[PDB]
Amino acid sequence: DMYIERAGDITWEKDAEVTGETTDGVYRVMTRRLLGSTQVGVGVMQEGVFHTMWHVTKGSALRSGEGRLDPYWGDVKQDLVSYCGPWKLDAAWDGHSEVQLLAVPPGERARNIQTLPGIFKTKDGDIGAVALDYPAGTSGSPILDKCGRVIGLYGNGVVIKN
């Protein structure tokens, strides 16, 4: 049994540290156990679509409150998966501005932390990388631009579109 729990709003924080319910927000991705529950990752609900990374769910369905969310699109190479709707997160990183990682670590409250991604060279091209370390289960945490928009997901890199 995998389920999601809302953890807060997607907002850029001005006083941040510097270095089937489908309500918009950031959600913990949880799997129930006989003894307890475990946070397997994080995801973003936006425009009635839930967005998380493939390694977190592997296309498994998600129960949101009473209702159920079914997978719609997925790609293992990209490590992404969307539920009941196609991918809605289209914003991109300018390639030079500081971003905010909205980290939602297991067992801890959500927090924002500003940082400047490094640009990592790849055969596909330049990419942004948030050089921060958070526990297992923080994957899927949203990366925000100054306007509160999701430009990427923690652990996956950030696309540049200047």
Tell me the chain's radius of gyration from C-alpha atoms. 15
Calculate the CA 31 to chain-centre distance: 17
126: annotated active-site residue: no
Helices (H) and strands (E) in the chain, counts: 1, 16
CA distances (Å), origin 89, targets 66, 78, 107, 121: 26, 14, 26, 23
Catalytic option among 51, 64, 82, 139: 139
97: annotated active-site residue: no
Q: What are phi and psi of 44, to 5 degrees?
A: -120, 125
51: annotated active-site residue: no
Catalytic option among 79, 82, 141, 145: 79
* Cα–Cα distance, 57 to 64 (Å, whole number): 14
Catalytic residues: 55, 79, 139
